[PDB]
């Protein structure tokens, strides 16, 4: 019964535009990473110790910051995103930033050892490194769970970039002015994704794939909510702002 329409010239161009945007903002080699403040890993195996020193915070905070910059770059390249007001663009970016960081980090995350591998031993990030940055298991364990669930979806790069686009352009963000326009753009992307899936993804990973992708966006809200609680606690630590960046402070604070 179900129709499988072809991708329109506009939909074809949109996937092209997005893929191109991603390749310009995601370094698959991770060759900027050494320019960050060096990672420090102390003896831990204690939340008191974690907050006392916060050895991994300056590095991961630099990574997060770096990523946010790339997300901003990426969002500005989304078809229609430039049509929104500067005020709206900022709101959408700030409230999706952390979600899209988690979302994009999937390219680096490996099921081999349940870590984020960005080359080396220095740039292999485990749960223990994220605790060393002052974040509790209440956020991390379900992040890994989300990361794994997303890996087993086996998304095409075409699907992966369209999802990052849909994440950003969400009309149900707190603070949006022109929610009608944002929804209009999101719809154009959703339909491209729904079309792409139906006529470009082979079974048995094709059936019910869109519904699972929308669900991952709901999990991303939970994590966003959790990150907010944990960043707030983290901020209360004295001389912590210096371990962050002017951009991470503004976007998350």
Ligand X SMILES: C=C1C[C@H](C[C@H](C)[C@H]2CC[C@H]3/C(=C/C=C4/C[C@@H](O)C[C@H](O)C4=C)CCC[C@]23C)OC1=O
CB of 179 to ligand X, least distance (A): 27
**How far is the C-alpha of 252 from the C-alpha of 215, rounded, in Å?**
24
Nearest residue (CB) to ligand X, 63 versus 185: 63
125: enclosing H helix or E strand: strand 124-125
| Residue among 7 and 118 whose Cβ is closer to ligand X | 118
Q: Is 101 in the site for ligand X (CB under 6 A)?
A: yes
Q: Which is nearer to ligand X, 189 or 244 (CB)?
A: 244
Find the binding residues for ligand X in span 49-78 (CB under 6 A): 60-61, 63-64, 67
Contact 167, 99 (CB under 8 A): yes
- Region binding ligand X by CB under 6 A among candidate stretches 34-42, 46-54, 97-105, 181-189: 97-105
Cα distance between residue 101 and residue 201, in whole Å: 25
φ and ψ at 162, to 5 degrees? Answer: -70, -35
Strand partners, 125: 116
Query: Pattern 207-246, binding to ligand X, x per CB under 6 A?
Result: --------------------x---x---------------
The conformation of residue 117, written as its DSSP 8-state character, comes to E
Question: Where the chain is broken, by preceding residue (C–N > 2.5 Å)?
Answer: 45
Q: Residue 130 interacts with ligand X (CB under 6 A)?
A: yes
Report the interface residues with ligand X, using CB under 6 A. Answer: 60-61, 63-64, 67, 101-102, 104-105, 107-108, 116, 118, 125, 130, 133, 135, 227, 231
């Amino acid at each position: 019964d179900s129709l499988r329409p072809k991708l329109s010239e506009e939909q074809q161009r949109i996937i092209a535009i997005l893929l191109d945007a991603h390749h310009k903002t995601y370094d698959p080699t991770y060759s900027d990473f050494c320019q960050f403040r060096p990672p420090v890993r102390v003896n831990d195996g204690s939340v008191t110790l974690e907050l006392s020193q916060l050895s991994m915070l300056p590095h991961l905070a630099d990574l997060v910051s770096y990523s946010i910059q790339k997300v901003i770059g990426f969002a500005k390249m989304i078809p229609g995103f430039r049509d929104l007001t500067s005020e709206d663009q900022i709101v959408l970016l700030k409230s999706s930033a952390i979600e899209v960081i988690m979302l994009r980090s999937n390219e680096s995350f490996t099921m081999d050892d349940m870590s984020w591998t960005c080359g080396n031993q220095d740039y292999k990030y485990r749960v223990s490194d994220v605790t060393k940055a002052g974040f509790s298991l209440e956020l991390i364990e379900p992040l890994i769970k989300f990361q794994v669930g997303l890996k087993k979806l086996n998304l095409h790069e075409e699907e992966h970039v369209l999802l990052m686009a849909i994440c950003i352009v969400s009309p149900d963000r707190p603070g949006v002015q022109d929610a009608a326009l944002i929804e209009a753009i999101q719809d154009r992307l959703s339909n491209t994704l729904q079309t792409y899936i139906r006529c470009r993804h082979p079974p048995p990973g094709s059936h019910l794939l869109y519904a699972k992708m929308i669900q991952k966006l709901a999990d991303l809200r939970s994590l966003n909510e959790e990150h907010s609680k944990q960043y707030r606690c983290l901020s209360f630590q004295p001389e912590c702002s210096m371990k962050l960046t002017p951009l991470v402070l503004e976007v998350f604070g």
